[PDB]
Amino acid sequence: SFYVYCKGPCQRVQPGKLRVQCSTCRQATLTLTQGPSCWDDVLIPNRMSGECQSPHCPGTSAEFFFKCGAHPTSDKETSVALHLIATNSRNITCITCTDVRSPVLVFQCNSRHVICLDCFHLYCVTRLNDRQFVHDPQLGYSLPCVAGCPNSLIKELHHFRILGEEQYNRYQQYGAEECVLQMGGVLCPRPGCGAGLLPEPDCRKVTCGGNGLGCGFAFCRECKEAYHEGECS
């Protein structure tokens, strides 16, 4: 079975359904020439093909979508696929707690390590609050295998939906902050602000209020106090 995050009404990880529409008219009228064999076939856009059987449309490209399977859903009531999550049919023990639960998340390390969702939730809630998530300019704010295996950063960041709503929003906040900093940017030091700013690297003067997006504070990026001439302190 496949698993998705249903944002409503389930607000949880649920078994999902795979469906397909024509990429041009966005209607489930396309008949596939062949069935999908791998995740890439359904995840990478325009990868598979067929004929949209609505006459006025010369539909060629197939667009796969996923729905929650726990209740009836409309055609456009889509959920994000959590492709790392799998039914634990073979009763593989969790790499962390050693217990058997279903479903489980499978890391894309060489050892394909398996973690239960309780422990994954735990791994995530622990690393975020300790600022131990990793920034990759290619992937974003992610976590590797809990075992610390190389090249194991989670690519689909919707997996962090297991954090729950509030912690998920915090995750996204923290990730955006980290993105700014890794790009050589600054967060405004004024209390109640904290706007993400990306000045030229040469500039010491950073001004935060033109369109209402800023607080107008002009500060020195080094000492983070009001802009001054010469050396700090």
Binding site: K17, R19, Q27, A28, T31, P72, D75
Partner: protein, 69 residues
């Protein structure tokens, strides 16, 4: 059980069926509602055309899923 039909992208309408109900039976009942021939109708579900001889059970149609007739 109920199956929703989108006739030529029209707003889905419910149709009551059984496990034993065939595709042509559904084609007929829809043809009557739309007053058209059942022979001009094609049923599309999960990127596949459903053949007349297939039943609802055989097609693994879940409660209140949608076909594109």
């Amino acid at each position: 059980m109920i199956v929703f039909v989108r006739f030529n992208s029209s707003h889905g309408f419910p149709v009551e069926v059984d496990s034993d109900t065939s595709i042509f039976q559904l084609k007929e009942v829809v043809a009557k509602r739309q007053g058209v021939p059942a022979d001009q109708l094609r049923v599309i579900f999960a990127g596949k055309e459903l053949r007349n001889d297939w039943t609802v059970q055989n097609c693994d149609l879940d409660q209140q899923s949608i076909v594109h007739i």
